[PDB]
A paper describes a structure:
Structures of SC-TM (N67I, S215P and E487Q) and the processed variant with the optimized apex PR-DM (N67I, S215P) were determined to 2.4 and 2.3 Å, respectively. The structures of SC-TM and PR-DM were very similar to each other, with a root-mean-square deviation of 0.40 Å for 445 Cα atoms. In the processed version of RSV F in which the fusion peptide is not fixed, the additive stabilizing effects of the individual mutations at 67 and 215 were substantial. The N67I substitution had the strongest effect on both the expression level and stability but fully stable prefusion F protein was obtained only when the 67 and 215 substitutions were combined, resulting in a 20-fold expression level increase. In both structures the loop between α4 and α5, which includes Pro215, is well ordered with the proline side chain pointing down towards the interface of the triple helix formed by α1, α4 and α5, and into a hydrophobic pocket formed by residues Val76, Ile79, Ile206 and Thr219. The conformation of this region, however, could be influenced by an adjacent trimer in the crystal lattice, which packs head-to-head about the two-fold crystallographic axis. The electron density for Ile67 is weaker than that observed for Pro215, due in part to the intrinsic flexibility of this solvent-exposed, unstructured region of the F2 subunit. Nevertheless, the side chain of Ile67 points towards the interface of α1 and α4, and packs against residues Leu83 and Val207. The two regions that differed the most from the DS-Cav1 structure included the loop in F2 containing the N67I substitution and the loop in F1 between α4 and α5 containing the S215P substitution. Thus, the N67I and S215P substitutions preserved the overall conformation of the prefusion state and only introduced small, local differences in two loops.
Numbering used by the authors:
A (entry chain A), B (entry chain A), C (entry chain A): 27 to 103, 110 to 479
D (entry chain A): 174 to 222
Write the structure that this text describes.
């Protein structure tokens, strides 16, 4: 169950009750389409059905030529600025490089001779699940060869014409996608891997039962965190690498920290000072530490499960959580920014709304059946989503999340009142409680 | 008519003459597709036309299964950093939640029994326009039932095979979109809602005539500001919620503020100081105040109409406009940032170009038929788009907008000259005229 | 060959050996589809093949009506914040404006009467390559006119029904794309311009042989840097402007600068100070200066060729490169930011990994066949990709690029040790070596 | 040359509709000749077309 606490003292709110699903590594799979080698198409037939087959075959050939151009290129793609820099498809591309080595394709080819799904050991030693999802070589050779391997074509039935267009379409769409994404696509579409194929791939994957269940019940999220990397087209084989998320952390507690500016509320226009907790984002317990995702928009929430990517995280000591109940705690130096910009806004939380209302701004909360039920005064305040449908701050209407769950309003003195505006450092974008303190003392020592 | 004024004193320019179209709220509509309940497909027929029908029916069934997986998940998605945080589909999702309640679908179902368009009152009390855009239940039951509700299939004509593929295609594409977007799409495609259906929906909407006209003449913009939210598939009904923008503010004056760095131009390399107005973006008059959109890229301009979203705005007193004619005005504390980074660049405006030219940079403006017609000297300067096609600053060529309209060059002393570099605070990212002043005095008091 | 150097003194690394391909200008081409003027469709025939033709014709007519709505709207779309602001399709839109002038379409129309590819001089004087990619007027008039210009329809063969759907599909997809992108698309899809058409357009373009070769071997990148702009649909002609990149700078040296925070490593928690080189990004030699791209994600790397856009660059003196071998050099004031935020992270480079390891973070580098082979101690360090497959910093696993190439570890004293923490200005987001120095002296003078 | 592929193999390659019609046209003459011989005990007069 989702619960939420608002801290009046620091103009912030924490939503608890979420369970983690963190992408920690990558699985790489090789997806293959078996192609037919087609040179000239031998026919003088002006028959309309032969003509449609020949047009479809030209589309097929142009698709192959197009992909051949692509395989000749190396495929590539508050506190967010503190993040490191990864190379998201380095793992997929490494596998893709191996597929260009001599006889490497042959391994794949003979392995998928009897079945359409096999585990192949590549030359470098990595084992990859390999899958043949479409056999155009077989279709073309068994249904289309008679109609154009001979000058006097045996005219195909209308149903064959339609069927070939259906089969070839997937090749055209895959090529279509690779062509406007420079050989790397994300999310992985159902053309790259159908829902059936993906579920089957997940089920045949060397992963825990929890991971299989998690991935199977959230394939749409799996798709969004996956890449499809165009690799090789040679020796009647199209191969692309699909890079799937590995979720090495599952079902640990996660919570979302929401923060909003906290300013003094003097009537004197520019005499006010402001403070904002900068450590907003997603937090998940992880291996004795806390995975912190400063850009909460990089996580996807499904019911009460949070899908995040560790590439977009910092690893913090778990004491970082103490900033929520006691921003002045001695065990962790809580991060804040400062300013004199007392502009009004709202932060819509999981179960309510934080409202930073300053100056002459009209700030209210409304129910759909009654209109305004609360008018906010200046300062930072909060309303739960129970009985509330919208919040308005100035000319901005916000709808609140109608998710069920309890909110707790933790009363406390706004900590901004504890500071003397004459020595308050109001130009900090990346500071903390202690940095502001020692800076204040350096101003007082000068006095 | 669009007009534009350049203020030499502050290295900024305002483009006037625009009319507002601000998204202020949301309308939620329920779009339905009537589905056929198909279990086993009874036929031993190896007939090629029966085979194509059976393949199309499998695609249909897999689509339904796919969407069933999706409906089991809760759908979710300079001065920009001052903005609040909304929940963009909270309204749509709230309606989507109601559709999961018992007998709620039945209301929709019986309401659309006689017509394909109706207004339904949901259990919570909200009235939503409901629309049936495709009846696959009817097609399958009346055209396809005989061919597979019996072991000995009555073989369908070739035209039926083609027609079914045409009809079923929309279901497949809708599913396709939802599958790579985790059940929430934006913009709303013509698969979700055809141009005809959307116009019809707009026309049947409970909105003013001005709003209907505005939305109808700009449906492509409406699409981009809309969401489609996958909701339920049960009891032979596919339902998704389409969340349409409500434009509560129309035809008020808007203007675009462009700003560029203003630096001193001493020959001594690092002895220069810089100032940039930070309040660039779109401004629209709105309800006695001004809606300010700091990220001008969040607004879409169509001719002289500006489409913005209030979620990406601050609400400011109208005195903010005074900063354009008098940055030192006593009624509003104009926002600026400071630095010593005198790098060269250009800002292409609505009707010209601002050029910040410093150091050894070559800065020119050219006509296509003649080449260089103006060479800029160091400092901040401006050229109108009349007679000018391009501007070059260093190795960067900019094309100017060829929109028709008059520009006015307001001469004035660059305000950066009024500051003493020895006490100039050059580390402010979020300051103002008054903050820089009082900071300067605190440095002078120490002296 | 790609090589790489790590500077221990400044926690940064430069990857060399790349060749430039910088977009410097734009080429504008007019792409045309010849349309048929179809009013009423005259038939009482309930024949299933006539019915499918009539359904396809309605789709055709709705497409035309849809595009007519679109042509009635004016189409529009660390150190990154230092960049100027361009108008990316100003050139394309200017050409698009000309196409709305009287008789301008007629010029295009008669020019493409004998061939499907011609160079037309527009009224304003600009010469544009013009291309007819699809003739629906001819198909409809020669194949479909008999079946519905007469009440008693001559029933078309099944192959014609299929063929028309194939031909019309491209019109529907083009319209589809324009409809969800407000008349401006990027990348340019194969529906807008097939691979064959694009290559042909490139080959007929008034550009050097090097440019043709470069564009032809990298069409997928060309597509991504191109725009398609919906222009006019009148007098049986659909015309859209395709805006292609001109690469005015080719095969000049480029290098990628990677930077990571450098902090002191005292055991006393908040007693540490940090420094980060802010000038990371791509650098290319360009016309006697250096084109600097602060957002390295705006450049696309294909093997050892870097595709960048000068619109996202600053033009710097070539002395900026001196910051790599000597950050205290007297010829260029090297840019840095400061803080006390000693958080751990890694930067994956072209040929290795920079590791900023501070506090209690576990930082290691591993091989796939052996596990941990290096454990990092606190400070900033580096490992080459030779023999290394992954790096871990806290809970974040990074795969390293497996690109071949030599790395050089340049030993040096971390420059952060040269600063006294008691007077170290740790609040600079946009400073430099000299700015930090003079600021330190102003603190010492107060002492 | 036209009918062998469709039935010398268990999995028939399905013939186009035009072939079906054409074969009926060609075979018809054989059927009519047989028809005539069958009601005339192998001797016909006049000799038909
Ligand atoms: Cl979130
Ligand atoms: Cl909202
Ligand atoms: Cl709920
Ligand atoms: Cl201070
Ligand atoms: Cl804009
Ligand atoms: Cl440009
Ligand atoms: Cl104009
Ligand atoms: Cl100062
Ligand atoms: Cl890069
Ligand atoms: Cl990675
Ligand atoms: Cl390599
Ligand atoms: Cl200081
Ligand atoms: Cl047939």
């Amino acid at each position: 169950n989702i619960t939420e606490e608002f801290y009046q003292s620091t103009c912030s709110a924490v939503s608890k009750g979420y369970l983690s699903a963190l992408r920690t590594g990558w699985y790489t799979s090789v997806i293959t389409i078996e192609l037919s080698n087609i040179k000239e198409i031998k026919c003088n037939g002006t028959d309309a059905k032969v003509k449609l087959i020949k047009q479809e075959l030209d589309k097929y050939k142009n698709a192959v030529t197009e992909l051949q151009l692509l395989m000749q290129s190396t495929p590539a793609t508050f506190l967010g600025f503190l993040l490191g820099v990864g190379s998201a498809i380095a793992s997929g591309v490494a596998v893709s490089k191996v597929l260009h080595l001599e006889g490497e394709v042959n391994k794949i080819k003979s392995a998928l001779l009897s079945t359409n799904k096999a585990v192949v050991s590549l030359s470098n030693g990595v084992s990859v699940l390999t899958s043949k999802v479409l056999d155009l070589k077989n279709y073309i050779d068994k249904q289309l060869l008679p109609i154009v391997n001979k000058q006097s074509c045996s005219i195909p039935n209308i149903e064959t014409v339609i069927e070939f267009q259906q089969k070839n379409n997937r090749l055209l769409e895959i090529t279509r996608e690779f062509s406007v994404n420079a050989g790397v696509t994300t999310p992985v579409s159902t053309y790259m891997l159908t829902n059936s194929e993906l579920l089957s791939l997940i089920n045949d994957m060397p992963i825990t039962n929890d991971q299989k269940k998690l991935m199977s019940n959230n394939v749409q999220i799996v798709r969004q965190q996956s890449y499809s990397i165009m690799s090789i087209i040679k020796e009647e084989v199209l191969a692309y690498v699909v890079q799937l998320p590995l979720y090495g952390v599952i079902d640990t507690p996660c919570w979302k920290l929401h923060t909003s500016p906290l300013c003094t509320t003097n009537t004197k226009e520019g005499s006010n000072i402001c403070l904002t907790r900068t450590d907003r984002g997603w937090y998940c317990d992880n291996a004795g530490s806390v995975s912190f995702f400063p850009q909460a928009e990089t996580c996807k929430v499904q019911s009460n499960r949070v899908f995040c990517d560790t590439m977009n995280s910092l690893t913090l000591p778990s004491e970082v959580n103490l900033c929520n109940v006691d921003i002045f705690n001695p065990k962790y130096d809580c991060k804040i920014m400062t300013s004199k910009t007392d502009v009004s806004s709202s932060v819509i939380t999981s179960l309510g709304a934080i409202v930073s209302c300053y100056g002459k701004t009209k700030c209210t909360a409304s129910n759909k059946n009654r209109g305004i039920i609360k008018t906010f005064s200046n300062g930072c305040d909060y309303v739960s989503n129970k009985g509330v449908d919208t919040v308005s701050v100035g000319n901005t209407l916000y709808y609140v999340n109608k998710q069920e769950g309890k909110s707790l309003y933790v009363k406390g003195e706004p900590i901004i009142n504890f500071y003397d505006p004459l020595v308050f450092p109001s130009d900090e974008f990346d500071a903390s409680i202690s940095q502001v303190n020692e800076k204040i003392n350096q101003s007082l020592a000068f006095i």
